[model samples]
Target: FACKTANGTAIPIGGGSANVYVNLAPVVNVGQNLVVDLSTQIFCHNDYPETITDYVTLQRGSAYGGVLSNFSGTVKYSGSSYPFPTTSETPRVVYNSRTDKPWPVALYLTPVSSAGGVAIKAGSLIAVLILRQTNNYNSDDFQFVWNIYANNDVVVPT
Candidate 1:
């Protein structure tokens, strides 16, 4: 299935395994907090240089491919009480394929009409929620990776 979903698995690279953060585990209901661990692994060589970064686009299941920009709520990131970055390259990190993001990271989410400068609303569908690499300037080179920390479920207004 194109929407084959898996929970907590090892992503192998450089002789070590990194946990792939996707899927709501232990299961969750509407209005529950979506929490998961995430890390972006990268490295650098003396002959070559590469900077790694990623953008997270959250959607509401396999139905309509709900975009993060479509979210109408206060989205927080990386344990910061403040809201996540509104600009591109949010939760910024860069490098060759040799560095990793802050670990056991938790992204707190609260569904709302609007906040700071972003808007998100609980919508009417569910399936394999996806986070795609919208901007990968170095996709051809080393891979830019991201682990979903958490996703908050919202109650459909309808």
Candidate 2:
């Protein structure tokens, strides 16, 4: 079954950009590049109130573990629970550095290449979540929330 965006766009859902999606998709290979573009817009009146900023982070993992194995390469997918090593693999999964930008943020995927790499295969999933912050530099204002926008994913051959 296929999935659609969050249903919040100017044009018809599939017309604006076939790139943006609201669901997790499969990563089917290695040496293939995964791109996740992000953008945000904030409307304000003539006399705006407080200053604000938001962050969007991309994370991935198997269908089982959330953030840990999602960022590591230890979760195996043999369809069986026998003899699977419980040790971390080389080039563990990792979350890209948090991007700090003002509201109406605009940025590119930057590609999840910091793991040494992310081993792409069947049954693997990717996620892009947004964080809302009010001030600058201080990490005390970070919070997780679902955001809306268009995203493009292209698989570049190595």
Candidate 3:
């Protein structure tokens, strides 16, 4: 999938001055589940180690609105399961040293319900995935925007 600005401007996935938006085909539904592999989306200098310290945070909201909260989902890395509804620093899925890649994170969203059950509304949900570098504070951090259309027929232009 090609990365583009909300205005339809093309940009480098890992070389953008600021966070870039990622395009997803066949928009995800309310009850659908998917796995997002972030290894291919990350690119940094060789000196920067790709470890858990350098992780991506998945939150619910746009870049400007300020991430209200992180959407709940199962997080896994290095063959270990991190608790979901992550309390601190949210999701901490790290890069796989053995494979030199980021572990695929699973997103299992249940259908919309109003019985106090987990449910996401049907609309354009602003989601931001931030890549952080914990090794050095304020060193290299990038954010990526994701516009998820829940329970809709919206398809992003290719």
Q: Rank the candidates by TM-score, best first.
A: 3, 1, 2
Best by lDDT: 3
State the lDDT of candidate 1 residue by residue for 1-158, as single tens digits: 00111343433322222223333333323354433323222212211224333333332112112224323223333344333323322342222333332332333333333322212223312222222222254443222233332243333232
27: Cα error in model 1, Å: 13
Alpha-carbon error at 147 in model 3, in Å?
9.1
What residue runs in model 1 are displaced by over 4 Å at the alpha carbon? Answer: 1-8, 14-70, 73-78, 81-102, 114-144, 147-154
Clashing pairs in 3: none
> How do these models rank on lDDT, best leading?
3, 1, 2
TM-score of 3: 0.38
Q: What shift in Å separates residue 40 of candidate 1 from its native position after superposition? A: 15
Error of 2 at 61 (Å): 11
Worst 10 residues of 1 by lDDT: 39-48
> What Cα-based lDDT does every candidate model obtain?
0.29, 0.26, 0.35
TM-score of each: 0.30, 0.27, 0.38
Candidate 2 lDDT for residue 30: 37
